[PDB]
Design a protein around this motif. Structure first.
Motif: not given
Lengths: 160, 161
Positions: B4, B6, B63, B65, B90, B94, B97, B99, B102-103
């Motif tokens: 993925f 960012i 984000l 993917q 999100l 998703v 996970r 994610l 991270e975002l």
């Protein structure tokens, strides 16, 4: 007097802070309350943040008489497009062809791709005139919420 | 799991951001607000033109993917070196996970976003509340928003480490 344009280094952070602060206080004097200007300057133009910015993306400085008197930050946006993220001269060094040199030479030094976009506060007549004189053309216009204040902005691009 | 990215949003991302916002709204507000009312808000703030302007003017991270934008975050300035997470969405598909972490963290890096950062969350959104609390956010305020005449109980949190 002779002038030089060069790539910035982290050491230039204090000089860049000073140019931005002086320019902001002068240009935004009727457009934005002082306390808001100072909040932004302390947030984005403090030395620590400037080290991060200068390390992350291309800055050029204009120097004359051994003093940084202007700076430009170019940022690549996506394949083949860029943004003039910051561009400032001290009020004392305007109207002398130096902004033109900073722009054109900074773009050379960093192989800046065109089109290059810039956001300009609609109230800054001097800046609007400069970009129009350099061949920038309007693409968009909008009101920014900036600390809860309306900031009318014109977005231009240059593509030659 | 898959790769993925960012990255900063671009104007082109406006349609995908609109989709993420619309899908997320319809899912999370389904028992609270009628969809026609949700859609009026989405029309006002997530139409493509307004998004182009917001993306130009304010820090927007996406984000991405499998070549699709699946989340986004918009960070705005507050006075006194504070920040607000003005939008953080999100797709329902998703979540859970790693994610969102991270975002948030990488989005903050990309835009030099300072702490403390504040966020408003609907009180019954157990998934978002769990996420913010897990990341170390602390409740500091509570209020009822009037949303087209409907009450929205809101918790305001901040993160400062």
């Amino acid at each position: 007097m002779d002038f030089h344009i060069r790539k910035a280094t982290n050491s230039d952070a204090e000089a860049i802070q000073h140019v931005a602060t002086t320019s902001w206080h002068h240009t935004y004097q009727d457009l934005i309350p002082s306390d808001v200007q100072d909040d932004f300057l302390k947030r984005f133009y403090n030395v620590e943040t400037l080290h991060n910015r200068i390390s992350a993306t291309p800055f050029a400085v204009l120097e004359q008489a051994d003093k940084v008197i202007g700076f430009a930050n170019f940022i690549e946006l996506e394949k083949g497009k860029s943004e003039l993220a910051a561009f400032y001269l001290l009020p004392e060094v305007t109207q002398r062809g130096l902004g033109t040199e900073l722009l054109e030479v900074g773009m050379t030094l960093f192989h800046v791709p065109l089109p290059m976009f810039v956001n300009v506060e609609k109230g800054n007549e001097t800046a609007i005139h400069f970009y129009k004189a350099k061949g920038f053309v309007q693409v968009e216009e909008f009101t920014e919420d900036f600390y809860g204040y309306p900031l009318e902005t014109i977005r231009f691009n240059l593509n030659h």
